[PDB]
Design a protein around this ligand. Sequence first.
Ligand code: URF
Ligand code: URF
Ligand code: ZN
Ligand code: ZN
Ligand code: ZN
Ligand code: ZN
Lengths: 364, 364
Amino acid sequence: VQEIDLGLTCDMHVHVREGAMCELVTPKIRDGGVSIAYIMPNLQPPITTLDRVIEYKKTLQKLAPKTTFLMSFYLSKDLTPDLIHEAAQQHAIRGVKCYPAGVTTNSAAGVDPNDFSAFYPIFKAMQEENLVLNLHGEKPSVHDGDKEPIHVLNAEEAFLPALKKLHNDFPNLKIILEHCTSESAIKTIEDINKNVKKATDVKVAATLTAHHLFLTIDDWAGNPVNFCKPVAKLPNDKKALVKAAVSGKPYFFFGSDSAPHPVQNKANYEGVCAGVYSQSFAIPYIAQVFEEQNALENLKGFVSDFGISFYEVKDSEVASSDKAILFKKEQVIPQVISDGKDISIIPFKAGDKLSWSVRWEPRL
Amino acid sequence: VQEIDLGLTCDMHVHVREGAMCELVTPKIRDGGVSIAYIMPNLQPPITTLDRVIEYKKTLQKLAPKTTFLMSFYLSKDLTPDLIHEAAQQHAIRGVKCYPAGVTTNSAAGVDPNDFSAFYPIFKAMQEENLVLNLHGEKPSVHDGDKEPIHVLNAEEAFLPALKKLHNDFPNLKIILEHCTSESAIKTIEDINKNVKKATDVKVAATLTAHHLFLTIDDWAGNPVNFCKPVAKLPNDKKALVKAAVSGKPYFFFGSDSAPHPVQNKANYEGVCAGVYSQSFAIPYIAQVFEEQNALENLKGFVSDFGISFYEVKDSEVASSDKAILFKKEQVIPQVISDGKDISIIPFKAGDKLSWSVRWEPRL
Ligand SMILES: O=c1[nH]cc(F)c(=O)[nH]1
Ligand SMILES: O=c1[nH]cc(F)c(=O)[nH]1
Ligand SMILES: [Zn+2]
Ligand SMILES: [Zn+2]
Ligand SMILES: [Zn+2]
Ligand SMILES: [Zn+2]
């Protein structure tokens, strides 16, 4: 069979929850082919204190000894510059993730993106400490009308001005637009990096999930098992995301936004939970897209090089030097991923076949 | 004011199913404030024979004796022109409802709206007997190359050319574009009727449901109770649909498409059944919209005059001359509508309050 050496794979956008769900999914980071994971903080309650973020990490390290864990704070009014400096100096966090209020899971305690200025003390601290500002780039929905209405299909586009202002007011702050879903977002990211030479000139980057390289609105209309935020959009939007993933440009890299929910939280008649579970086959999902685009040469950059470069991951922190090797063995996605107790998850593309699998090999 | 006499209200898009669902739902046409109801044919198997429509009608008359029932055929691969003639002259049907294949509930036995020509002999038979052809105007979805993609958001707009051709080849045929959802469809219906002098000049008309005057995509993204076909679209579309409802023009009138399903067919993680159940409060729902637009003068035309005029309903056919009286008593929509046995339904806008109720008064 043929093999592809991918090195230290990166998934810079992971949800791993708490409790038994966390014991179920955290080992699946490695099985999915991912060596380094950026952990998102939207627990209940949100992670806003130093002791709890340092209480979450070793719990994950205990569940997965070989996986490198970059942690984050949840952007909240309970954060202070001294908290940001203390957390950075103790190597507890690697960035702060912002959730607009009400737009996705556990975002009710979030910020209004028609402000952001109230968090300028926080951004100055993060800029001084070289932390990353992660943005769930969606404006909350407004349907009445003075300004043009915001809804799930243009909310991301309506957010692009807020990103542009943040980057102008903080030119040295590393900012990621998480899980880009619209062509407008791709063009804004490309234009911001118009005079970019090498990868380290990138200060504003964007992550792309696995599922948005497959899904369009027709896949989640009537299928809550494919419903997520931001919502998958039009075929032209999916084309732009795929061309950006295989582009080879250093300001697009992989962030799965694997968001597990028990099956009974997706089979609601109202209030369905947003989120697609992709951890168990994260790298093979991406390999399939890259294979169909005849762009497999560019896979290592999108899932490994560019995320390590942007996050400045050193071997000093990496928990294991094992290399993820992709090999072309066909496999079938199970129908459920269960902990054999109370938790069952429907995986992304359940029942479908993938051309690749993943194994680990040490270095030297 | 306090009371509005709406006369003989008509809901020209009704689904009542069979069995225990039917016994539950059919009496709620009258409870909703509707005297005349056009019954749809998408049962299992579809209604395509004279014996099955008549027995269906007899069941509905037994369950709701004071409700006037207009029946329909399912546009099917085994319908015949002489069937249309025999059914029309026996006064068993008033029209044939077309379902594009796969686009909605029980549409698998449907048509491909790209080769309507196979049904022109049937359309020519319906034209001769002055029957109504009801159109679920949506093209089936296309993601597969060359041709521009079709999805739930433009499937209605992609269907408008077919409606245009069908009316051009059959100018005397009464055709209804059922449940409009897009501004594109509204503008096309306006253009088809540019200089129509009054209601009997209308031959291509459009029905608006109750739920499409409230809903947008943000309401059904995470709420399968509000998921239906065609999907509710953008605020700009709802602007047009609402405006057309209160328009006072005779080519827009009420058709609820109340489509009941048991709750367990809505709380799926995939394959959610399309359909919003609104029968039980059909007229009060619409009264809310006409009230909020300060257009209650036009409620009688939208909910009674134009439907009766277009379908040319005569007093000889009506099962009861009782008048629908709308009166401003506040009521609360239940959380569930149950038959006390196996069937529970979440009504549209469950738990919300309506400013109006409806009662019946006889003709003396
Ligand atoms: O962006 C997100 N979508 C869905 C989730 F469950 C989550 O936790 N975060
Ligand atoms: O147009 C329709 N949508 C949903 C249904 F269940 C139905 O029967 N008809
Ligand atoms: Zn997010
Ligand atoms: Zn996320
Ligand atoms: Zn329909
Ligand atoms: Zn219908």
